[PDB]
């Protein structure tokens, strides 16, 4: 199962949460809850003077860190 | 890492946004301290701290992967509370640092 | 007999704090579970050495 | 340099955890429940008569004075039963239940929504998607469909 | 016998740092169990090498 595939317990929880957010009815509660599953964040690190993404740990849940 | 000090801003009130810390141990060290404190009797060594010897036994009843998940889950909740408190502290201190600008 | 002591180990592993309060009952069981064995041995030693 | 101008507080100290008890000799009559999704509670120390949780080992049922046990929550339903005989079902996404001998329950989760906020029509669509995803030979999709089906099957069983 | 030793193993696996305090009780139960065998072994050797 997903355990030896490498994804952690917390990504599994977040995926189950995303599924619960999918199924539930249209209403104010879904409007509050979609915020708690959507992916908007990033990582970044400073070069000598410029910004650069640290894309080794992805935000999307299907993927696996390396 | 052997210890993670998560710094954040605690919102005590609209005029009070103080500092706060979560000193997270390492997993292997946390497990060893859990065993060493589950063996001996329950005695608090610091005022305001709670005894949790039955918890530190029942977690011994819990399997290994579940204990790792326990650690990661609670550390995640700690980080989340830190982010939420700093969000609110930002939005509360910005008003003060804007009315003085005005 | 050893079921008793084994259980004491399991309990003291679960709750070491309680170990001191568990040791009496352990011994108590052993004081009697073994006694029956003696009452099973006594016959075998009372059957042979006195009956012709 | 100023000698340590700052002296930050420990944030743990701003919470009020229960203190466990040895040999108290008194059994609680009704538990004190506390359910929490990501950060916010939905219930704060409510008197409760009974509660019923789901785990990987199987379904458990907790009453007052239940033994101290800490364990996972398998993703499924969660039944609360008040002293008035009514009930309240909540769907969850994992967590950890912390029971107390004195009678306290902290069910900390990532999500908590009542069944009343869920519709079978919208669920039926997700089912075949997760299933066919489990059929697709690919580690990226198979595990995701398996997890989605794992959360959906108890819902499809309970709504009926 | 083996129940006693198995329990010691499982207890130490549940609480290693208690392994020193549980090993005594183990031995105790062990020996006494074994002692019964010896008596059961005494008779079987007391019944042939002396009796006519």
As for how many domains chain A has, the answer is 1
Question: Burial, A14: exposed, middle or buried (Cβ in 10 Å; 0-12, 13-18, 19+)?
Answer: buried
Give the closest residue to D96 by CA, choosing from A38, B55, B80, B79. B55
For residues D80 and E14, what is the distance between their CA atoms, to the nearest angstrom? 33
Q: Where in the sequence is the domain holding E40, given as residue range(s)?
A: 1-52
D139 contacts: CB under 8 Å, gap ≥ 6: A5
Residue D124, helix vs strand vs coil: helix
Nearest-Cα distance to chain A for B31, in Å, is: 18
Shortest CA distance from B41: residue in chain C: C17
For residues D143 and A12, what is the distance between their CA atoms, to the nearest angstrom? 10
Backbone angles phi, psi at D139, to 5 degrees: -65, -25
Give the closest residue to D75 by CA, choosing from D143, D133, D144, D154. D154
Nearest-Cα distance to chain B for A10, in Å, is: 7
Chains E and A touch (3+ CB pairs under 8 A): no
Give the closest residue to C25 by CA, choosing from C11, C42, C44. C11
Give the bridge partners for D55, in sequence order: none
Beta-carbon count within 10 A of B80 CB: 13
Residue D50 and residue D81 in contact, taking contact as beta carbons nearer than 8 Å:
yes
Taking an 8 Å cut-off on Cβ atoms, the answer to whether C2 and E6 are in contact is no
For residues B86 and D39, what is the distance between their CA atoms, to the nearest angstrom? 14
Which CATH number characterizes residue E39's domain? 1.20.20.10
Q: Which two tokens stand for residue A48?
A: 């000598």
């Amino acid at each position: 199962s997903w355990r030896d595939a490498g994804i952690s317990y917390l990504r599994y929880l977040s995926i189950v949460t995303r599924c619960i957010h999918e199924v539930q009815k249209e209403g104010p509660l879904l409007t509050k809850n979609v915020r708690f599953s959507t992916i908007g964040w990033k990582s970044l690190y400073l070069d000598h003077g410029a910004t650069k993404e640290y894309t080794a740990i992805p935000a999307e849940l299907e993927k696996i860190p390396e | 890492w052997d210890r993670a000090q998560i710094v954040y801003n605690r919102y005590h009130g609209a005029a009070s946004q103080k500092l706060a810390i979560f000193n997270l141990p390492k997993f292997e060290d946390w497990k060893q301290k859990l065993e060493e404190d589950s063996a001996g009797d329950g005695k608090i060594e610091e005022d305001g701290l709670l005894q949790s010897l039955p918890m530190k036994t029942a977690l011994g009843e819990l399997e290994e992967t579940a204990v790792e998940d326990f650690y990661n889950f609670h550390s995640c909740l700690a980080v989340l509370n830190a982010v939420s408190e700093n969000e609110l502290s930002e939005y509360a201190a910005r008003i003060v640092a804007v009315e003085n600008q005005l | 007999v050893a079921m008793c002591f084994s259980s004491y180990m399991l309990a003291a592993a679960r709750q070491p704090n309680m170990s001191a309060k568990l040791l009496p009952y352990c011994i108590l069981g052993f004081a009697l579970s073994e006694a029956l064995a003696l009452f099973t041995l006594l016959i075998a030693l009372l059957e042979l050495f006195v009956f012709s | 340099q100023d000698p340590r101008k700052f002296f930050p507080d420990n944030g743990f100290r701003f919470f009020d955890g229960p203190e466990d008890s040895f040999g108290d000799g008194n059994i609680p009559a009704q538990i004190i429940l506390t359910l929490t999704r990501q950060d916010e509670f939905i219930l704060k120390q409510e008197p409760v008569a009974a509660i019923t949780i789901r785990t990987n080992e199987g379904e458990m049922g907790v009453l007052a004075g239940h033994e101290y046990t800490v364990q996972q929550l398998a993703p499924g339903i969660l039944e609360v039963e008040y002293e008035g005989g009514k009930k309240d079902q909540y769907v969850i996404s994992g967590g950890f239940a912390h029971v107390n001998d004195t009678g306290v329950v902290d069910i900390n989760t990532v999500e908590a929504v009542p069944l009343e906020e869920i519709d079978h029509e919208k669920l039926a669509k997700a089912l075949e998607e997760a299933r066919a995803k489990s059929q697709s030979p690919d580690e990226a999709v198979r595990i995701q469909g398996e997890i989605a089906l794992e959360i959906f099957e108890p819902l499809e069983a309970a709504l009926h």
